[PDB]
Amino acid sequence: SKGEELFTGVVPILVELDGDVNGHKFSVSGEGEGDATYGKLTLKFICTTGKLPVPWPTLVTTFLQCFARYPDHMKRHDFFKSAMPEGYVQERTIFFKDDGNYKTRAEVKFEGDTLVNRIELKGIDFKEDGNILGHKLEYNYNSGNVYIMADKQKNGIKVNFKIRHNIEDGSVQLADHYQQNTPIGDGPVLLPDNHYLSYQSALSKDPNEKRDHMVLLEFVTAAGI
């Protein structure tokens, strides 16, 4: 495909997010590389406005499916790569069980040769003393699958999944994700059969970085076909 060629090597990533969580304005910037060949993502984020009002783990999913590693036999299902270099719109609604919910809009594309992801995030209905606002979430993350199906009508895709965040007392916090992807151009794309993505992430810190931030490593491989 058209965009397949762009992911042949290691790609520079640039991430910019603007959010407001219950009137808690903030900004985050990340940089890192991408190696679609191994389904590898390596990023670092800094909350440029100070202290991040919410828990890092809550942004993980928000913070590049085009870096998925598609087995050769599944190449014809890669929608992300197909949408490039034009890019696509990734829209999201993330509901936290018994709490607020994030609404996301992001544009992912190429700028010159840097893969860019701009996000506008809006979050409301959070309990000030909730798990989120009250930062009860442990700095860790579990493995999982993201389910993918076509969106013929829309010439896009619909993805649905759930994340389970650990709470400091042993409990679990639910995050149900709703997701639509549409391509930015009027270009042709790849509409896939149903499959999913297998995710593995590890969060970490930068011993030397004083600023509020998050180092995130992630492996993603496509399956179910």
Pairing relation of β-strands 101-111 and 114-124? Answer: antiparallel
| Residue with token string 């409990």 | 171
User: φ, ψ for residue 70 (rounded to 5)?
Assistant: -95, 115
Separation between Cα atoms, residue 115 and residue 11, nearest integer Å:
7
The three-state secondary structure class of 80 is: helix
User: φ, ψ for residue 201 (rounded to 5)?
Assistant: -130, 155
Pairing relation of β-strands 114-124 and 10-21? Answer: parallel
Alpha helices by DSSP H, the chain: 79-82
Separation between Cα atoms, residue 142 and residue 81, nearest integer Å:
26
Element (H, E) at 161: strand 156-166
Closest CA relative to residue 81, chosen from 21, 46, 19, 36: 36
Considering only the top CATH level, what class is 1-225? mainly beta
Closest CA relative to residue 1, chosen from 192, 219, 195, 221: 192
Separation between Cα atoms, residue 157 and residue 70, nearest integer Å:
16
- Resolution of the determined structure in angstroms stands at 2.6
CA-based end-to-end distance of the chain: 19
Q: Which method, experimentally, gave rise to this model?
A: X-ray
Closest CA relative to residue 67, chosen from 225, 221, 223: 221
Separation between Cα atoms, residue 31 and residue 16, nearest integer Å:
9
Reading the block at residue 90, the tokens are 């990734």
Using the CB atoms, write b or e for 177-204: b if 16+ within 10 Å. bebbbebeeeeebbbbeebbbbbebebe
| Strand partners for 122 | 20, 103
Reading the block at residue 51, the tokens are 């202290």
| Strand partners for 44 | 31, 215
| Strand partners for 56 | none
Closest CA relative to residue 79, chosen from 12, 157, 151, 5: 157
